[PDB]
Nucleic acid binder design. Sequence first.
RNA 1: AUGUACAACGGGGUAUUGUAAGCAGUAGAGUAGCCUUGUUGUUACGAUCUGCUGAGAUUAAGCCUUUGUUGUCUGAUUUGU
RNA 2: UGAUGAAUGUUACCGCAAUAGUAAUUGAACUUAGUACGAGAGGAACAGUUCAUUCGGAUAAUUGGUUUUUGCGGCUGUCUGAUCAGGCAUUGCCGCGAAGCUACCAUCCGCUGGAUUAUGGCUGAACGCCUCUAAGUCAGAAUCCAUGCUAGAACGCGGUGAUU
RNA 3: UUGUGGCAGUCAAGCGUUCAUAGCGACAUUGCUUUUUGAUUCUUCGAUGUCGGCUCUUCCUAUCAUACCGAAGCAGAAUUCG
RNA 4: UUAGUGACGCGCAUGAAUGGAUUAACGAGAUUCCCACUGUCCCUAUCUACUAUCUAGCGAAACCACAGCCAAGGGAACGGGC
RNA 5: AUUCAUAAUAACUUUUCGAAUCGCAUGGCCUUGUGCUGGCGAUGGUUCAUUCAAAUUUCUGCCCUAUCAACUUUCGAUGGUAGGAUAGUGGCCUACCAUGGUUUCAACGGGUAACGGGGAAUAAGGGUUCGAUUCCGGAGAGGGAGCCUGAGAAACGGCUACC
RNA 6: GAAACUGCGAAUGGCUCAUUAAAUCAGUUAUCGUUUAUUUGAUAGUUCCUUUACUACAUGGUAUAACUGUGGUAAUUCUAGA
Lengths: 171, 126
Amino acid sequence: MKLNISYPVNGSQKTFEIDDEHRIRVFFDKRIGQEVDGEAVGDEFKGYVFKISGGNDKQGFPMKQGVLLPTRIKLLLTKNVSCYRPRRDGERKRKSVRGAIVGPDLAVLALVIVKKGEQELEGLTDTTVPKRLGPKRANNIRKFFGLSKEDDVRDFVIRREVTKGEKTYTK
Amino acid sequence: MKVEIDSFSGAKIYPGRGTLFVRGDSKIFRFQNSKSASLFKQRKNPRRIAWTVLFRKHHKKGITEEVAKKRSRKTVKAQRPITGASLDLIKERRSLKPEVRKANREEKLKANKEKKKAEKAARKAE
RNA sequence: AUGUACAACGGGGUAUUGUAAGCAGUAGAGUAGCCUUGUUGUUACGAUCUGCUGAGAUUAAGCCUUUGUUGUCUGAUUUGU
RNA sequence: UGAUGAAUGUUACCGCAAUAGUAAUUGAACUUAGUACGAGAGGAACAGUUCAUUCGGAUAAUUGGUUUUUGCGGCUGUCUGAUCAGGCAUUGCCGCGAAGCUACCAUCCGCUGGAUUAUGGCUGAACGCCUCUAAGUCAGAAUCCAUGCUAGAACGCGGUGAUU
RNA sequence: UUGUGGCAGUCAAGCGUUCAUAGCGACAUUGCUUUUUGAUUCUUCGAUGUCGGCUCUUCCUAUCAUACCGAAGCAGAAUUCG
RNA sequence: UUAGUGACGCGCAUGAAUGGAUUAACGAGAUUCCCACUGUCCCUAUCUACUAUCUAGCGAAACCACAGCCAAGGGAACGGGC
RNA sequence: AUUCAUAAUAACUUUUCGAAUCGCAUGGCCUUGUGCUGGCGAUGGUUCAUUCAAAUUUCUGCCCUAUCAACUUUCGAUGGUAGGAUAGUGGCCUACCAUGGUUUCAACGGGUAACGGGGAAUAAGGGUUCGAUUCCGGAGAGGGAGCCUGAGAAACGGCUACC
RNA sequence: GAAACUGCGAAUGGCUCAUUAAAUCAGUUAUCGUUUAUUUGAUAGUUCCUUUACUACAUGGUAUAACUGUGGUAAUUCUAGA
């Protein structure tokens, strides 16, 4: 099986090809939002605790929230909802999914960390991806920094230097 | 192996124990026992049958599953820079914000500038 | 024929069934009568519903098990290289 | 067909095994192989594997059936002043229903060695050759007999214990 | 008893492209069986319950299939004879 | 589909009050097919009461040369006896 | 021709609109302040009217058939009252009520190699026949049903199901 | 200045004539019985709601896409996770 684990503060993410079939039998019959023990799955993950975010089973059909079963279903989905993007306004659509219970049918299980255990993880905690963008709005910058109502966000602006050739500029 | 759930009673069906039914519409039902099977053939409603899990959960009996939703009593705790602002100098200028005579003097400069602007504009208009 | 003895009851378990009677209800189609005519108004009747209640009942008779209780435990006949 | 049983000195236990009976049967599929063979057309086989047909012998975990558990619930009519709880209705009727019985309607199992026939042969004369035969001799079948399985001679037997 | 019914042999004119016998085998002929049908009337008329089917066992083989084999006008498959 | 029905008719031997040809309705009439239904059946199983069974008590009858093991033989041609 | 337009009293609203939008140009007063004012536009925005539409609607008019003369109303057919729905009237639908309504002046039913019309061929006149078919109005997207989005679809080169 | 958010439009066009015989349609009326985006012409002094601190108006809050990357199906204009 695979565990697509993520650490959201570091913004990091990695897949882990898991075996120890019984240390994933623990994951069996589990819902979304629930948090089980890193040590229980793996002493390499000793002390850690994750949260079962979701996952794709075979045939790539994701895990959807709220349905409360492991078996697959055909839902007449609509906008503002996971597992369907509408290619037109108004289009509802019947699509197949898998539900919010964990079992062998799954192939990749998506996890998020809420607490960092005692040891350190190679591709999640030792690393941290930066914030790709800076806040583009005045007050968002202003409150992000904690300056004032009048501290000139215009000069607190972000400047991201890049070189076209040798001419360089922050754009 | 796996264990499953009676359509009617909603009970674990250990392997072999029990019957299975496949309606013409390809709906696969499972029954732990001929009791459930016979009721199903009678077209009964388990939500009305009392000993069933559906009635149990519809009348809210044995409700030890749900507890509450947790809440954190704090903030995000990141007054960080925006990757192009040098957070040290950012906090330094945030602290220089009070005692605002600097921005006030810049305003006074641009203010006398607007004075002279209207003056010279009227001069050019004349 | 005085014991890790036996038996009848009781208990526990396991199973079957489907939520006992009794009480209560600001539940109840409503119909009549009360008046301080409410804002649950009260009263008589009224299937049925809900809570106590996966409650109650039955459970070896050819189910299992008992630290329990109460008892029982020398009557007859025959047999020889 | 099953079932008892006097008598053997008594009684109990463990055994032998005469004799009799006997059972396992056939096919398909994949592979061998689109190979061999065949000009082409078409088209094999032995071994191996998985399955089934027929028959048999058991068993009841599962599923199904059966239900006087007259166990639980409900239903009609009527009687017990009403309720509670019950009687009668040739087991009143329905639904569930354990246990037990039971089903190719369910499941499990169904042995390997020898002598042989037919047939093909080895050496080999008669018949100075030759010949499977005449003396001798090899392999060989759903055959035959044993292994195995069933009963155990009630006048077949043995070993052992205790014997007032 | 066995004409007739049925079954199997001897012989081999011929058929089989040529060749009687791989396979068939007319004309002639020797036998067998009693599952037919006759013929007979021994027993049975002071009664042997009388067709078929159903059920169920057992037996014969003149073997339809299956086991092993031989022959072929058997290349293989399929088939035929034994 | 030797059945059933509709046609054909050198009809062994159809036929007109020895009544012919139809004929609604009716039939515990004979017959065929279809729907339903089903333990008739594939294929049997299970349950109940009364029996059988054992007991106490009561207590017949039919039938009977003598009696009661098989094979073959011959024999009144199919014996329990020889 | 109105209970019209429109105005006011009294309240209702889970609360509607009343510019936090954008490009150019930068203009003027001095109370010398980033003070105050200012232009040409785009976008959107409540109401009314307009325009392109849309839906309903009045009179008249349609081929052959009586080997179709009674038709409609159970469970809407005709009307009325009240209400619901509609964007809106109204059996559009419901509750209740009266029992009516169409018919030889051909109802109703059947058939149509019938979508209709503007028009085409053909002729002295009269006329007969055709007209799917370039323009107009309708219907449909394989048959049916349903519906979301939207001002506008019962959309099909959009969704849902069944066939 | 791709992609993406957003706003428009995708209900026009085009194709066929299956349907349909007071139905469509044609002329002719009405909406004093209705919706109408869009255009076009006009049109929001009155929005502090214990209306005094209850509230920045040189102006307020929230994602979320695109993207970063983890990726999952054999396949989908398939999509989740951070």
